Design a protein around this ligand. Sequence first.
Ligand SMILES: Nc1nc2c(ncn2[C@@H]2O[C@H](COP(=O)(O)OP(=O)(O)OP(=O)(O)O)[C@@H](O)[C@H]2O)c(=O)[nH]1
Ligand SMILES: Nc1nc2c(ncn2[C@@H]2O[C@H](COP(=O)(O)OP(=O)(O)OP(=O)(O)O)[C@@H](O)[C@H]2O)c(=O)[nH]1
Ligand SMILES: Nc1nc2c(ncn2[C@@H]2O[C@H](COP(=O)(O)OP(=O)(O)O)[C@@H](O)[C@H]2O)c(=O)[nH]1
Ligand SMILES: Nc1nc2c(ncn2[C@@H]2O[C@H](COP(=O)(O)OP(=O)(O)O)[C@@H](O)[C@H]2O)c(=O)[nH]1
Ligand SMILES: [Mg+2]
Ligand SMILES: [Mg+2]
Lengths: 430, 430, 430, 430
Amino acid sequence: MREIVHIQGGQCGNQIGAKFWEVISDEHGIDPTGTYHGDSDLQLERINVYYNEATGGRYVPRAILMDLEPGTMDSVRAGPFGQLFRPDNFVFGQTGAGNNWAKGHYTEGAELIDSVLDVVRKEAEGCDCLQGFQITHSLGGGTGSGMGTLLISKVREEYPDRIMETFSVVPSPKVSDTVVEPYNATLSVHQLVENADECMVIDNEALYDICFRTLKLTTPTYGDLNHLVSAAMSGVTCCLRFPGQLNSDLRKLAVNLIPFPRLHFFMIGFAPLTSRGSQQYRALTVPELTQQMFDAKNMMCAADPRHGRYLTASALFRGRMSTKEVDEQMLNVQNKNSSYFVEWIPNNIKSSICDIPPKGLKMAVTFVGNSTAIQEMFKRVAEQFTAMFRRKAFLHWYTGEGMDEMEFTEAESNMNDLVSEYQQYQDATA
Amino acid sequence: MREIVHIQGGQCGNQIGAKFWEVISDEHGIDPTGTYHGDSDLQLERINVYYNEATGGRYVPRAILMDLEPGTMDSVRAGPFGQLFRPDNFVFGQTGAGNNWAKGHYTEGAELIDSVLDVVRKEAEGCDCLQGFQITHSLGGGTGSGMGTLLISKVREEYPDRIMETFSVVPSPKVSDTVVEPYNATLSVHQLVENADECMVIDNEALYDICFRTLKLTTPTYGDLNHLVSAAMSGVTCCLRFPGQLNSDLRKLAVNLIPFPRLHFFMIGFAPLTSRGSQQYRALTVPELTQQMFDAKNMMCAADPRHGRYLTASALFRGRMSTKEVDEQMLNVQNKNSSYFVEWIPNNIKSSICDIPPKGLKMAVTFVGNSTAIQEMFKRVAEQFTAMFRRKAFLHWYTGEGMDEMEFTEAESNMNDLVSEYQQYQDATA
Amino acid sequence: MREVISIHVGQGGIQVGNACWELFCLEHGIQPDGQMPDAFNTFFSETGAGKHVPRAVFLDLEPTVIDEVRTGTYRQLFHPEQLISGKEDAANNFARGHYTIGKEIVDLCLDRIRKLADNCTGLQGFLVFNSVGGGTGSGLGSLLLERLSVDYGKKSKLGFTIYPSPQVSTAVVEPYNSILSTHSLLEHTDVAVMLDNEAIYDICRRNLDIERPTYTNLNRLIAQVISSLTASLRFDGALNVDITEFQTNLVPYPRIHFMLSSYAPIISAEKAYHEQLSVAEITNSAFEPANMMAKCDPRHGKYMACSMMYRGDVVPKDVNASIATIKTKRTIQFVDWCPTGFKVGINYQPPTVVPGGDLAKVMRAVCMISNSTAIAEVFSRLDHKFDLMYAKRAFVHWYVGEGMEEGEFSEAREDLAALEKDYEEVGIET
Amino acid sequence: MREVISIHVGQGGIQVGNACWELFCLEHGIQPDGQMPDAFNTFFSETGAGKHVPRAVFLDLEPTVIDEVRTGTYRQLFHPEQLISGKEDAANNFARGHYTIGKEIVDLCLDRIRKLADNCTGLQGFLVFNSVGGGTGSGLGSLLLERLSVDYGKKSKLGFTIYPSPQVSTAVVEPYNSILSTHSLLEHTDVAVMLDNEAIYDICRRNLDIERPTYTNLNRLIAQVISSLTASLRFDGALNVDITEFQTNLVPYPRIHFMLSSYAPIISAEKAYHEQLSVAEITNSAFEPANMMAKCDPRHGKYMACSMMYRGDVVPKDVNASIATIKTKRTIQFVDWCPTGFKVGINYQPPTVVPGGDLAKVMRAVCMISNSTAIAEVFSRLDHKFDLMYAKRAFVHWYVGEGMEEGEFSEAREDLAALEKDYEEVGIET
Ligand SMILES: Nc1nc2c(ncn2[C@@H]2O[C@H](COP(=O)(O)OP(=O)(O)OP(=O)(O)O)[C@@H](O)[C@H]2O)c(=O)[nH]1
Ligand SMILES: Nc1nc2c(ncn2[C@@H]2O[C@H](COP(=O)(O)OP(=O)(O)OP(=O)(O)O)[C@@H](O)[C@H]2O)c(=O)[nH]1
Ligand SMILES: Nc1nc2c(ncn2[C@@H]2O[C@H](COP(=O)(O)OP(=O)(O)O)[C@@H](O)[C@H]2O)c(=O)[nH]1
Ligand SMILES: Nc1nc2c(ncn2[C@@H]2O[C@H](COP(=O)(O)OP(=O)(O)O)[C@@H](O)[C@H]2O)c(=O)[nH]1
Ligand SMILES: [Mg+2]
Ligand SMILES: [Mg+2]
């Protein structure tokens, strides 16, 4: 019951999913052949959340994979746990977008999306009670940031009451791999605010910083960043698949973390994270988890959370632990940092406990906090956008496929209005 | 009891039968040597429907094969399961028709048909209780469309109370292999409406479209089209050979699907159909079967069923399933599509359940719907006929064998009258 | 039980008969001695033990070519007394071979034809080969056709005549006998195929890259066309075509039966394998005006009907997908009163290669027989050439003194005028 | 399902095509005979059984080079009839190869291009190679580009032109046809890469330590650059880049698409292994002005956008840590309206070594494609060279007498003046 379907688009989203599904399968004891080989009874009670049942007793994820080029899905199939995905759900084009948002949203993405919407509708109509959808995509690419966001609007138009999740990677100015990143980032943020019920920003720069400083491993690769993102993704829905002292589905988090409908851009972090050589030194206790949870360097975004004030915060503890300690520590982390918490909403931290810890760990915490410090990312994105747009650089590529500069002006104005009205509440006082 | 005999004519009909009998033999576990090697008891209880018994314990089909040239039957004998056919039933001429309807219906087909009628009479007089006849032939050829249709009238004149089936392939204008197709199509449709109790149109264009889009196989061949047609053919009489919750012979379908005696031209479709790579993704459920069953692209004809309104519909479910789900789904498919169902006849969908599924499949559905959208095929056939006839092109070939233009005029007028009076009920309101 | 008899008269006829009879013997595995070291029955007959005898007869009044045949490697193959030979040549005089010396030889040929026909049981029809621009060829062909049309009646006869080139000519008097022979075979032959030498010279030069061709290279291509036409009678195929199934598909009216052929692909082994030879590209090459086997421009006239044969591993869906592309093109337009004009045949046996020849071995080939309105140009230019010399009555004394009447020249002119008027009358839209 | 077609015209084009086609065959394991003793599909095509055929066509009017190709070890590889050859050379006259002898050859080349394109299903784009300072090369390249731009339209074409050196020159008239060809490809080619010989001579002398280089050593480096550019289409990588993803990242405006390349490391086996070849040092060497592949100074102008490809075991974090260092340096400054200008690609396959060549085997390499404002100097110096001789109308009679008009020289001068003004207008800060 109350299950969700997985939809991913683009190369970055496909690579994120290729590790997210591996993590989920390892958590539920599903072999790469789809056969259950788990140890505990609880591993099968709520498997309908992510997995479907077919004849022969094997399980198949309800994931939908889409891209405008076939290479990435032809590569993910040969990887581990690549056989679980149903071949029918693979939809792809023969041309690609070339990191051009217009091509992936107006000319090419519009004709292809009917086939993927057909299978999306097939998956949603069938399921017992829908909880919602979760979306993984990147804002630094053309086909992803175009087709995914248009699909968001199409899904929202047909299921207005369901919940919608988006895990979005925004292009940081530090590690830049594409010159046309500001254009399709700014165009995508315009559409994303209007339809997504929840959005979670993730930055490659913050992932590299975490890998270099906390884990202290010499050579980070995309596999480590994907693993961290996958652990963070799994931590959110853990209590929906396992029993606990205070169950809290996604809708309950939506109620408690979004004060106003347009303020739904969160930054997350996962604890504990320790190096291989120091994993024996540390002792896992609730104070040790909560001190690392609120650490500024532990956030999955380069945004500095002590440059603003938290509107609200959430924590999803895992493992068996006493609730009194959790509540007193949450109170203590809020009394010692009163300057960084907005004062006109008292008791702005939500907590939840799940009795099933991750495989290999005795305690774990997932942190989701809505803070005013996120304005800095939109500020720098808009700064680069307006630095590049004033000369109409690279504009002809977009304008040759039916798009105009008016949609750029409206997007810039709406993004600046969002930036302004997000900080409006930072200076608000009672 | 209540068995039927098989009669096929022409090259296309012979190739259809060469796969239909293979499918039937594989279903009943009969080896190509005529020896039973089946597993289940039910495989032998009603084998008298299609197979006769001879000394030595082997089984022989009661099929009659006729053509005006010996090549096709000399070729089908060397194929698999070709030895089952009794050599006595092979009747052929030494000249052929050359795709000329007049030669295959007036000059050559008239003299030969006595021998084939002798064996037809031998087969029908002997059998326990006759149910009827089923005919496979093509309307795009001369000898087939002539001799088969004249044989229809001869059989109807002697057995007016029995039921008669015809599976007719009409020449589509998209994939045209013969230039004189409109003439012998129009001449044949004139005679076919007067005598056939049921007619089922099949188009090569729709078969290619299905093979390319649903199965997604690279290189279709006549073997795949024949296999699809054979599965559809077998699905109709399944409950007459196996037990079920609601048995429904051919006469019961005749009662419930033909409102007026001249409206007996149906288009069919088979479900499920899935690609090799996606056969593991899909889960076989009644909603999944019924959503594909009413799909427009799944019809075995290029006629678009949402261009008209269904007069009535029928479904023959296979496998063990709950009847409540079937009835509620049939109601749901009729409430959500009220615009495409005629309103002066309520509850115009017939359902039947057979507990024996096809070999290798757990559930299957055969769909037979009488719709007003079939007018488009006769419209285009008559359009080509009147485009070619106004100049008297290729007319001398037909007029040199005792035929005249008056029979062409009467055929055109009767066909146009059929087209008009078939759509007369589309605009009828209560 | 299907047979065909080929008639070879004149030097060109015998030299193309030799070319086709190496190819048939090679294709059926028969050694030049006639001994094999059930498909042969179409062209050959079994003698009871050992050798096979061709169903062919060679005619000529001039003994040199027959004597060359009776001493080559094929001396043991042909029956000794079916190579009818005369003593005195007609010497390019039509009146000689129709009134003076051909009459005394025609009786032996008719006796041989009867002796060959009584052996066949399923005689499909006759084939005849004759170069038109010669005395004995045209005259004896006319006389034989006139005798056969009354001895047998409705049996089909096919004529592979070689008309003179527009400007290239070997004789100086060939228009006279060409016009007279066209008069004779206009009302006496069911099919006539155009074969002038200049177009085939251009084909060899452009594709085969031979700068010094001889007659053998031309005759090998003609033999390949004949083999492609008659393959469907002696090999298994998915879509068969018989000889009698032509006047119902390519001949709109009894007078109009002159059509021009084309073949594809034509390529040498040195550069054949570098390209894939898909069905689409070969069917495009076959319709190219420069690849017509007769020097006529199809862009100057409408099409009436196209009958085109495939052989090899071609799949019908690929054929349909290519017929659609041709219907799409704006440079090829069909006549108004013909909506569909294509007859398609598919065979499985790939074309056979002759050792030491020009063509390479390929798996796919296409041969088209197309009837078009543009053929009237050759008649007009031959008529213009005839009128120039008939104005002054030049070379007429060589014909009046051989028993022909003075008025016989005028009525051939009137029949050509009638044919040209008929071709104009048919091609106008309604 | 991704393909690309490479066009080689002129002596320099054919001699660099040979250089790239040893490298591709070596990199995919294909023997020179074409036989292997799924990544090949980008450059090759499967013939069904055995050999592979390159997707390349060789053009030249002068037969010596093609005859040398058709007798070397690679005689069996290329299809025999895609090595189009002429009889008479253009002899460094541009008007000859654009108006006199190139027109009669261009039709065969276009037919070959169509025959190769119909085979591909996912055609990414075209590659073309031509030395600019020659008659046939520049003229036929211009004519082919002009025909392709209208036959296909939006398909991407890439041009690897070799402009003359600042002072070193082999001809005396090459500025004229260089300017005319720049005129022709300015409005017809999507990407143009600079390749003058003097810079590569200096690279060989300084790094490879060869004091007597020949053309083969230059062509091997160019082939390595091509392989590095196209590696991402046929090998798995953590950060892929497609050809269509260029005009969205390197081309700010439709007129500005001339950029200059560089490669690193370039080192011999005698001293390669003594140093560690870290990613930081190779990415520093790639940006050194002395390692530009075209003799232009980047210190004299701003950068617009840098697209730079890695291959081997490079980790993204090390790439980011090196992009930061380059942004730090004060000697490299980017244009004001471009905050981020780097597009990064990472591939896993290390560069392959050719036996008997100059370069050694290394695990890391970097190839950069950089668009900079400093490129205007080559245009200015070519313009100055052109004006000196055009003042006195020298050598003009060799062009006017080959069908070209007198005024055609002036408008190329005006377009170069427009381009130089545009480059100055873009580089000024706001
Ligand atoms: N295609 C082709 N045409 C030929 C060949 N030999 C002769 N011809 C044509 O035949 C025409 C003349 O007729 P021939 O066949 O040579 O001689 P004939 O038909 O026996 O008539 P006579 O001159 O009386 O012997 C010439 O114009 C040639 O174009 C040949 O081998 N191949
Ligand atoms: N990099 C490089 N450049 C070459 C090579 N061969 C010739 N060139 C350049 O090409 C220029 C002249 O054009 P070519 O390619 O030699 O001759 P072409 O393009 O065939 O033109 P034609 O003279 O009419 O035959 C010279 O200035 C050379 O700099 C080569 O092998 N490598
Ligand atoms: N975490 C992670 N990020 C990736 C990976 N591959 C690419 N990216 C990021 O995705 C961005 C490029 O997105 P792109 O591939 O063009 O998206 P697309 O246009 O939808 O295919 C880069 O800035 C990378 O930082 C990966 O395997 N893991
Ligand atoms: N499904 C199927 N159709 C066929 C096959 N062979 C021929 N046809 C169809 O039959 C038509 C020609 O019919 P024809 O052979 O002339 O019938 P006949 O005159 O009775 O021999 C063509 O348009 C084909 O589409 C086959 O093996 N399977
Ligand atoms: Mg002769
Ligand atoms: Mg040259």
